[PDB]
């Protein structure tokens, strides 16, 4: 129930294999074993990219199904993501969170940072679980950017990535940000490429 | 996993389980058709055979037994069953 315009473009995957985002970590856990294509003799495992795109259009079919586009929240605490969340939330309208999450900010409405979202999008739920654990109290669905060392508790639809590279963290926000606009009607045609350079979403320090 | 087809398991994982604990158990041994250069005759032989056999005519050693599987001798050929 999604036509051939929703299929994987051969030009699109040319980016991903260039971006080195199909190299999982060297220790699978027991829940993410469907996502592994084959092991390399070096010691690394190769993610199935045709799976990581098939569970990429699904998240955008959830993000587009919300009334108010400021009820999505996108969080990072690593340095590598906390530019990419901002330009995501810039021209979509989500309420970004970068740097430090303060504890007790989805409960305890006497704080000034109090929020009551409809989704939560996290990057690295190993070193981020305070937003995971608090969302469990108040019926908040969640979407993650899962590696193969990722504790996948409380986490619904789960984009398989490589959370070690710098392009590969940024790019998955970009393709997600590209796709969410196409569903809204804010663009014109699926087949035309995105005018913005994808290097904008990266991170750089002098 | 919570939902799994237990009745039609994949053949790539059945090869790794123990001899007993597959769906319906069975052997993982076989039989060989070994030949000696001299007598040029055939003799069937077990794979993990635990006695050192010899040909009935060319009284020459064929398979030394040890461990878990028999090691064949040199200067000979074989073929499965």
């Amino acid at each position: 129930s999604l036509p051939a315009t929703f299929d994987l473009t051969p030009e699109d995957a040319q980016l991903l294999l260039a971006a080195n985002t199909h190299l999982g970590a060297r220790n699978v856990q027991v829940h993410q074993e469907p996502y592994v294509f084959n092991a390399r003799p070096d010691g690394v495992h190769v993610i199935n990219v045709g799976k990581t795109w098939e569970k990429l259009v699904l998240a955008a079919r959830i993000i587009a199904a919300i009334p108010n586009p400021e009820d999505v929240v996108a969080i990072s605490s690593r340095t590598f993501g906390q530019r990419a969340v901002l330009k995501f939330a810039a021209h979509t309208g989500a309420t970004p969170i970068a740097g430090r999450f303060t504890p007790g900010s989805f409960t305890n409405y006497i704080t000034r940072s109090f929020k009551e979202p409809r989704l939560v999008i996290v990057t690295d739920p190993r070193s981020d679980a305070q937003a995971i654990k608090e969302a469990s109290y108040v019926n908040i669905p969640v979407i993650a950017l899962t590696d193969l060392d990722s504790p996948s508790e409380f986490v619904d639809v789960a984009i398989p990535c490589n959370n070690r590279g710098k392009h590969s963290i940024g790019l998955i926000w970009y393709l997600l940000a590209r796709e969410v606009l196409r569903l809204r009607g804010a663009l014109v045609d699926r087949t035309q490429p995105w005018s913005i350079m994808p290097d904008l979403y990266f991170y750089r320090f002098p | 996993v919570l939902v799994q087809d237990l009745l039609h398991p994949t053949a790539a994982s059945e090869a790794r389980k123990h001899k007993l604990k597959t769906l319906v158990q069975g052997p993982r041994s076989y039989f060989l058709d070994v030949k000696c250069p001299g007598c040029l005759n055939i003799t069937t032989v077990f794979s993990h055979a635990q006695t050192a056999v010899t040909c009935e005519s060319c009284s020459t050693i064929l398979c030394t037994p040890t461990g878990g599987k028999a090691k064949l001798s040199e200067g000979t050929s074989f073929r499965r069953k």
Binding site: - | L2, V3, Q4, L6, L7, L23, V24, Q25
Partner: protein, 129 residues
Amino acid sequence: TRSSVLADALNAINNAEKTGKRQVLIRPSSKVIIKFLQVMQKHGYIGEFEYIDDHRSGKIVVQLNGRLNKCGVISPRFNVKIGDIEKWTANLLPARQFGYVILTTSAGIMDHEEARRKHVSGKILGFVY
């Protein structure tokens, strides 16, 4: 060592439906396992099942819906008279309008309403709700 086959053929079920699975694997099968199962299947508590055979005593693979709270076994199979079903049934079962205790009775293995209108009695076997 292994004394009752049925007693841990129903311990394998609810031990893997408290964790919300959908299928289990029983080993060995029996003539009295299958008929205990065939009375939890004409009432809806389980789905369908298949019988392997491997020339020794087969295994079974059962499909579970969502509807069992507990199924069990009573291990000295005592001797229920006919005035004494309703004291066994006021103790084992959660409410007066559902659930069943099943019996081995001289005209087959059946539940306790089915044994009322045939007017028989026998030895106890287990319960289901």
